[PDB]
Specification:
The structure is cut from a larger assembly and holds eight protein chains of eight kinds. Chain C is of the alpha/beta class. Chain D has a three-stranded antiparallel β-sheet, with helices on one face. The radius of gyration of chain D is 21 Å and the shape is extended. In chain E, the strands form three sheets. Chain E has a five-stranded mixed β-sheet with strand order 2-1-5-3-4. Chain E is globular. Chain H is of the alpha+beta class. The chains are: A alpha+beta, B mainly alpha, C alpha/beta, D mainly alpha, E alpha+beta, F alpha+beta, G alpha+beta, H alpha+beta. The structure holds magnesium ion (2 copies) and zinc ion. Zinc ion (ZN) binds next to helix 2 of chain A. The PDB classes it as ribosome. The entry lists the keywords mitochondrion, translation, closed nascent-polypeptide tunnel, ribosome. Human mitochondrial ribosome in complex with mRNA, A/A tRNA and P/P tRNA. Chain A is 39S ribosomal protein L32, mitochondrial.
């Protein structure tokens, strides 16, 4: 089946510019109270989620320097310590991961 | 590239026209444009109107004070013989007064039942800034006007049209000058209603005062016709009844608009400015 | 087009002819060439015809600019401000004499479609027709099947 | 017609689906936090919850060891399940994982999600927080509560 | 005596007169470096104009989001109306309804909504009755409603509003919200403020109390379009901020014999903290009950 | 210009309080209509030939077998009536029809998920919304 | 090719008189030869058309189309260009006056088909044009109300003459 | 279907033209001043003390041998040249060079100023309207310092004549759209700026042209601008944190 006639630009503007074709404005946008950047109400902040992944990656690179190979996971808990911190009362008998950096303010010691 | 010159030249002309439409130039005085001789254009002005103007007087009817003051400013900058030119102030005062007293006489004798307030508002409309400037821009009065600013302001143009009447008054006299006011100013209220030139408010309160002067009982309003009362498009005909005698009847969408138009209809009959009135007589005086 | 062009109603300039007739043609500007076969008919019109035409029309200012040109034209300006430009290129004297006279007779209003061949500001003298013109009035202005004094 | 169908159709078939979910669960036990498409995470989240239930049964239960051996491709993670993860959620009876939606990835604009095991040693995610109790609306409600409580005691 | 419709005509002229005098006192152009101290955009500096630029103008430099959500400004630890000119260089911070501890913002909103009610009280009653405003009690926000004491003519000594009358007050309040009028703040000397309210006896007493507290003896003035009133503390920038507004009831204070003082109560919520129909009806009932400041 | 739901701005302490508050109100509203003959009922006419009474709005539970005294087996459907009330009444004249309409609702639903015009209709009726 | 859009930021208006009103600032900016379809880009320029600078940037920041990241880059550099070069005081006091797409210079490659057949595919390119104006976004036109419909209908009933007569 | 864009552009340097070329770039003006001049602190106060200024200006030139010997060189290439006329001649150049900014007469501005000064004046006002005028002169100008270049640095010699000016001026700068941007066209203000001139003595067609303006560290702050400014802070990344 082939077109019997050529469709005019008037017919085609009415199909292309139909409200269903148009992009719909979004009203679920708001500002992140921490950084001030934009975000959706149901989605995490891309900026704050990015700074968590940069630090999480650094911690995961230190974990590799301790295991020193594959299939070498521990059977104990793990703790992250920063310059100016020592094992806590509850952080006894764990795998401490030393980080040469000041503890992030958002990263609260538990 | 095709050889030839006629099509390229013809295409440049269409481009110029297109450019002018997209970017039209500012208007300028006709004297600045080519093919202009002030002395030849001012003689034709009179012959065109079949009047024996006086050139010395007519040339000063187009000279305005604003143009004289600016003409001096140009000389001071260049350090340049004194000018003895006179303005049109004196000529304008003579023409404006004569026009107000001649229009009144014409109207006071044609409509003898109209009050002075109505005859004054009519004379203030025929000698108005809108009417006098329309007659001036169609009699070549704005092309000869020696003003400082173009386009000529309406007030400046109004003062120049009455100076031409003052020059004609001195040259040809009142009788010949009164015909110029009948043929150019009286003809500006032919297809116009009375209350379209003489705007009033509360016409019903004005009709009650004219019926007291004639010792006539106050009018009573009543409904003569009616249609579509409940609808959005109604029609009412209200009739004014003095001593149970119909004097006027007017239509309207509401009962208040129709009652106001009926009073306007009665006033036109009282003053004799109806549509049925016989036309103004322009025939040569016997 | 009529639909592809504009229109106007029949009219006059300042109610011309009502009190007096005023010629609307105000200026005529000829552009002839001393040399040039296109302007031959225009040169002979300037030698014998234009002078007699100005005597009859003293209210029209005529300008004759003789300059080099390939297409002679006559520009007519009217009181109302309209400007009509026309070409007398390769036209005989008789053709230019009937054209210039046509310009003198015209008013300047645009030569376009005229809707009606008549115009009047006072079309009625007995009253414009309206629905109640030929209807009789009823006692007490009652309506069809309307109970009075209920 | 799909009325009641609870399981999704991913991968190349039923077996490939289990193998996709197994590779995500195995990576979740090694790192305790991963990012993957939202639908694939919501489907694996159920298995991550029931895997801890088998770790609470103990490493001496053969049935529990046969599940971990199958669901954990890396065999060094099996002791971590029975000795690290299960003890951690000993007090809790449910809600071992939290799933959160994250910005769509750039390559294919796919809906993404992050899933983790509660109690991990990783930097806290920027969890959504409810409006403070000191706000205008919440202070108008706190006052209403007090009266309703005060009237009831009367 | 001046008529009610011409009494406000002079209060504006006196208000505008003093509003223009302060502007002339300022030099042609003097710059102040305003530093931003907040979690967001830390380190930004605004080189603004003295006695002309406002905190709102500083937000316009940053983004439209700050403008819409910045209800109040904190200048050197002191709250600052968003439309109040800045006199000297100083640190600036922006406050919102949704914060960890928005105590100052809640007070400002609660005060503004009370002032709005005073304006509609001076227009509802006829011109024959003498409506004399007294003050706006500084009641907490947990009380459940904001109030504005008012006095009425002796003729209306026992007249009690009805449900339909209370509804008309609201339609006049929402009509004031639709105009989107900005609160204009003016700090004047006590002596100048007495002249504006010299006609009303109650306002003069309140002004005198404020002068005694401050060694400078300056009194803050706020006006909504034509209506002018004396209030304590900062206010919100615009009326459009309040989405839900309603006057709940009217209570007569005691003792009534020496003088009658009526207490118009009300409750409201802004656009940022919109409530649900069901939850909003619960707040009204609490508001209808009479509240007494501590 | 952003939409909102009933618990978007509420805190951790007010969410449980609001839930129980509106829940207790529904209980009291439903337990206040159990005495319709004492609350100024309308006249009770007898049954006449050609009369049509109201119906109900039930909830389909499931299906169950059923045997008669002859041994034949019949399968039945369980229809549970839960929170069925009469909402309003329209007379024959205002009905624009031969009969007169009676409106009935069923299955109480949440007030946080209904339209304002619907919520106010139930507010003056003294009942929770119906599905 | 034509590049008139870049020459509109070079016109210099004469100094205004003391009584004249403040003239809004106009900022023209564009990006040429974008590897994208003008038909697909038209839907993005139509979205922000009439919006504020800060509202447009928020809609383009959460859009999944590729053109969104490109327009947002053009708006950010036109925003800075306004305050730095065109004497705009507040960077948020801007709105999208004009926003459309144009066809660019496109390439032609061969697409192979079956049975020794072939098609000619074009590597599409586009331009994006934007104009920023100082001030707040003009208020949207309210929808026509019943009073205006009736007021217009009665006006047509009053403008009707007696046709084909005197 | 094999046609592509003709995109082969590569980026090169403009600092120097092709090497091993007998033709070389010919420069008419020097880049900077040969000997930096520091006007003594308190010269603004001496503006009121006109008599002391006259004494100091005469004494300084006489006392500064290096400055008095440079005039000898300027007179070896131009015999008919006096020092009691240049300060009166500089006023014509200064005034005439600032009137070319109003009408955008850059063809004549090159004859008045050097190539080193021309960009500084015109670059910023390329799309702006300037209305500068010279209302009055307060104190006569004085030739504070004259110093010549090292002989045949490039085979050419330049002479610099520092001149002090103290006069009233009117400045109003309008933006692209005609809106007032800086200054007031009604009110003039006092100005104290030291204008430096230069002339290529070797070049037979050389002339004295404005070179630059000495800005003393003890000058008063300039007039403030009309609008407000926002100076953003560091645009930090997610990982990096803010520090006081
Ligand atoms: Mg698939
Ligand atoms: Mg093949
Ligand atoms: Zn964030």
């Amino acid at each position: 089946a082939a077109p019997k006639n050529r469709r005019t630009i008037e017919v085609n503007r009415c199909r292309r510019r139909n409200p269903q074709k148009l992009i719909k404005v979004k009203n679920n946008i708001d500002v992140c109270p921490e950084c001030g950047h934009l975000k959706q109400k149901h989605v995490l902040c891309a900026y704050c989620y990015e700074k968590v992944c940069k630090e999480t990656a650094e911690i995961r690179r230190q974990i590799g320097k301790q295991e020193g190979g594959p299939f070498k996971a521990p059977t104990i808990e793990t703790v992250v310590l920063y310059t100016g911190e020592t094992p806590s009362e509850q952080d006894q008998g764990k795998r401490i991961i030393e980080r040469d950096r000041k503890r992030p303010s958002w990263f609260t010691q538990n | 590239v095709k050889k030839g010159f006629r099509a390229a030249f013809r295409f440049q002309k269409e481009l110029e026209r297109q450019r002018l439409l997209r970017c039209p130039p500012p208007p300028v005085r006709r004297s600045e444009k080519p093919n202009w001789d002030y002395h030849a254009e001012i003689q034709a002005f009179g012959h065109r109107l079949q009047e024996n103007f006086s050139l010395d007087l007519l040339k000063t009817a187009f000279v305005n004070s604003c143009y004289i003051k600016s003409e001096e400013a140009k000389r001071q900058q260049l350090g340049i013989v004194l000018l003895n030119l006179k303005s049109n102030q004196e000529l304008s005062e003579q023409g404006t007064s004569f026009s107000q007293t001649c229009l009144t006489q014409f109207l006071e004798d044609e409509y003898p039942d109209m009050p002075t307030e109505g005859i004054k508002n009519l004379v203030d409309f025929l000698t108005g800034e809108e009417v006098v400037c329309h007659v001036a821009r169609n009699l070549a009065v704005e092309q000869l006007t020696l003003s400082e600013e173009f386009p000529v302001p309406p007030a400046v143009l109004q003062q120049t049209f009455f100076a031409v009447i003052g020059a004609l008054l001195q040259s040809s006299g009142p009788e010949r000058t009164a015909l110029f006011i009948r043929d150019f100013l009286i003809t500006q209220m032919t297809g116009k209603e009375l209350f379209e030139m003489w705007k009033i408010i509360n016409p019903m309160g004005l009709l009650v005062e004219e019926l007291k002067k004639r010792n006539v009982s106050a009018p009573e309003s009543r409904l003569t016709r009616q249609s579509g009362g409940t609808t959005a498009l109604p029609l009412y005909f209200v009739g004014l009844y003095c001593d149970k005698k119909l004097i006027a009847e007017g239509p309207g969408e509401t009962v208040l608009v129709a009652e106001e138009e009926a009073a306007r209809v009665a006033l036109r009959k009282l003053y004799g400015f109806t549509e049925n009135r016989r036309p103004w007589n322009y025939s040569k005086p016997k | 087009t009529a639909r592809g062009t504009p229109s106007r109603f029949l009219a006059s300039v300042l109610h011309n002819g009502l009190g007096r007739y005023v010629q609307q043609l105000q200026r005529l500007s000829f552009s002839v060439s001393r040399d040039g076969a296109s302007s031959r008919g225009a040169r002979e019109f300037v030698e014998r015809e234009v002078i007699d035409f100005a005597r009859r029309n003293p209210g029209v200012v005529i300008y004759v600019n003789s300059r080099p040109c390939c297409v002679p034209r006559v520009v007519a300006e009217y009181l109302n401000g309209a400007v009509r430009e026309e070409s007398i290129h390769c036209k005989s004297v008789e053709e230019i004499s009937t054209l210039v006279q046509k310009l003198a007779d015209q008013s300047g209003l645009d030569v376009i479609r005229i809707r009606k061949p008549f115009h009047t500001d006072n079309p009625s003298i007995q009253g414009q027709w309206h629905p109640f013109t030929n209807k009789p009035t009823t006692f007490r202005g009652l309506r069809p099947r309307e109970v009075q004094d209920p | 017609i799909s009325h009641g169908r609870v399981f999704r159709r991913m991968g190349l078939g039923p077996e490939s689906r289990i193998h996709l979910l197994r590779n995500l669960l195995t990576g979740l036990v090694r790192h305790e936090r991963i990012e993957a498409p939202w639908a694939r995470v919501d489907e694996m989240r159920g298995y991550a919850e029931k895997l801890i239930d088998y770790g609470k049964l103990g490493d001496t239960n053969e049935r529990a060891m046969r599940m971990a051996d199958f669901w954990l491709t890396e065999k060094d993670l099996i002791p971590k399940l029975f000795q690290v993860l299960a003890p951690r959620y000993k007090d809790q009876t449910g809600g071992y994982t939290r799933m959160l939606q994250i910005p769509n990835r750039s390559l294919d604009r796919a809906k993404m999600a992050v899933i983790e095991y509660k109690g991990n040693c990783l930097p806290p995610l920027p969890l959504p927080r409810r409006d403070s109790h000191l706000t205008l609306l919440n202070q108008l409600l706190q006052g209403l509560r007090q009266d309703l409580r005060q009237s009831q005691e009367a | 005596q001046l008529s009610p419709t011409e009494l406000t005509e002079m209060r504006n002229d006196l208000f505008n007169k003093e509003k223009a005098r302060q502007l002339s006192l300022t030099p042609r152009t003097e710059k102040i470096e305003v530093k931003h101290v907040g979690k967001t955009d830390p380190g930004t500096v605004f080189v603004m104009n003295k006695n002309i630029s406002t905190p709102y103008s500083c937000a316009m430099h940053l983004s439209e989001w700050y403008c819409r959500k910045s209800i109040l400004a904190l200048v050197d630890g002191q709250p600052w109306d968003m439309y109040k000119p800045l006199t000297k260089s100083c640190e600036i911070k922006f406050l919102t309804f949704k914060d960890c501890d928005p105590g100052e913002v809640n007070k400002a909103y609660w005060r503004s909504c009370a002032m709005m009610m005073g304006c509609v009280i001076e227009r509802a009653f006829k011109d024959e009755y003498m409506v004399n405003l007294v003050r706006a009690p500084e009641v907490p926000v947990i009380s459940g409603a904001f109030c504005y004491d008012v006095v009425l003519d002796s003729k209306l000594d026992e007249w009690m509003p009805t449900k339909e009358n209370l509804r008309s007050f609201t339609k006049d309040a929402h009509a004031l919200i639709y105009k989107d009028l900005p609160f204009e703040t003016l700090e004047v000397e006590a002596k100048v403020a007495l002249e504006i309210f010299q006609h009303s006896k109650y306002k003069v007493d309140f002004i005198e109390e404020k002068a005694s507290q401050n060694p400078e003896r300056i009194v803050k003035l706020h006006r909504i379009g034509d209506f002018i009133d004396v209030s304590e503390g900062p206010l919100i920038p615009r009326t459009s901020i309040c989405f839900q507004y309603e006057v709940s009831a009217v209570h007569n204070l005691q003792p009534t014999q020496p003088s009658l003082i009526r207490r118009f109560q009300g409750v409201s919520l802004p656009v940022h903290l919109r409530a649900h129909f069901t939850i909003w009806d619960k707040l009204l009932e609490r508001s209808r009950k009479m509240v007494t400041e501590d | 210009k952003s939409g909102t739901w009933w618990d978007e701005h509420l805190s951790e302490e007010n969410v449980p309080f609001i839930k129980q508050l509106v829940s207790d109100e529904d209980k009291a509203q439903l337990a206040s209509k159990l005495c319709p003959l004492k609350d100024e009922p309308w006249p009770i006419h007898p049954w006449e030939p050609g009369s049509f009474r109201v119906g109900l709005i039930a909830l389909k539970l499931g299906m169950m077998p059923l045997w008669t005294k002859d041994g034949q087996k019949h399968v039945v459907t369980l229809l549970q009536v839960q929170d069925c009330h009469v909402l309003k009444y329209t007379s024959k004249e205002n009905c624009n029809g031969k009969m007169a309409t009676l409106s009935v609702g069923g299955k109480t639903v949440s007030r946080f998920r209904k339209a304002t015009s619907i919520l106010e209709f139930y507010r003056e009726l003294g009942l929770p919304p119906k599905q | 090719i034509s590049r008139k859009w870049e020459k509109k930021n070079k016109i210099v208006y004469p100094p205004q008189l003391p009584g004249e009103p403040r003239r809004p600032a106009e900022i023209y900016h564009c990006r040429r030869q974008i590897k994208y379809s003008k038909d697909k880009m038209w839907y993005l320029a139509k979205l922000i058309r009439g919006m504020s600078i800060d509202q447009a940037l928020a809609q383009l920041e959460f859009n999944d189309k590729k053109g969104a990241k490109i327009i947002k880059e053009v708006l950010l550099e036109a925003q800075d260009m306004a305050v730095r070069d065109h004497n705009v005081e507040f960077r948020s006091n801007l709105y999208i006056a004009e926003s459309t797409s144009g066809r660019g210079q496109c390439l032609k490659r061969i697409r192979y088909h079956g049975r020794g057949r072939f098609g000619i595919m074009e590597k599409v390119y586009c331009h994006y044009f934007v104009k920023l104006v100082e001030g707040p976004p003009p208020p949207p036109e309210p929808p026509k109300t019943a009073v205006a419909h009736a007021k217009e209908y009665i006006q047509q009933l009053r403008s009707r003459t007696i046709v084909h007569t005197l | 279907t094999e046609k592509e864009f003709m995109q082969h552009a590569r980026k090169a340097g403009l600092v120097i033209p092709p090497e091993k070329s007998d033709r070389s770039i010919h420069l008419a003006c020097t880049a900077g001043i040969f000997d930096a001049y520091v006007p003594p602190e308190g010269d603004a106060r001496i503006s009121s003390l006109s008599k002391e200024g006259l004494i100091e200006r005469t004494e300084r030139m006489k006392k500064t041998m290096a400055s008095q010997v440079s005039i000898r060189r300027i007179k070896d290439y131009d015999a008919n040249f006096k020092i009691k006329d240049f300060p009166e001649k500089a006023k014509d150049i200064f005034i005439e060079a600032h009137l070319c900014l109003n009408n955008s007469d850059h063809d004549r501005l090159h004859t008045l100023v050097t190539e080193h000064c021309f960009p500084d004046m015109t670059w910023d006002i390329k799309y702006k309207t300037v209305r500068w005028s010279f209302v009055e002169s307060l104190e006569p100008s004085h030739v504070v310092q004259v110093r010549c270049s090292s002989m045949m640095n490039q085979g050419n010699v330049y002479g610099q004549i520092t001149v002090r000016m103290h006069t009233r001026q009117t400045l109003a700068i309008y933006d692209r759209f005609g809106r007032l941007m800086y200054g007031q066209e009604d009110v003039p203000k006092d100005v104290l700026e030291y204008v430096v001139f230069e002339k290529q003595l070797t070049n037979p067609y050389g002339s004295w042209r404005m070179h630059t303006k000495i800005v003393p560290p003890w000058a008063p702050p300039k007039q403030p601008i009309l609008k407000t400014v926002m100076i953003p802070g560091p645009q930090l990344k997610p990982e990096e944190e803010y520090e006081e």
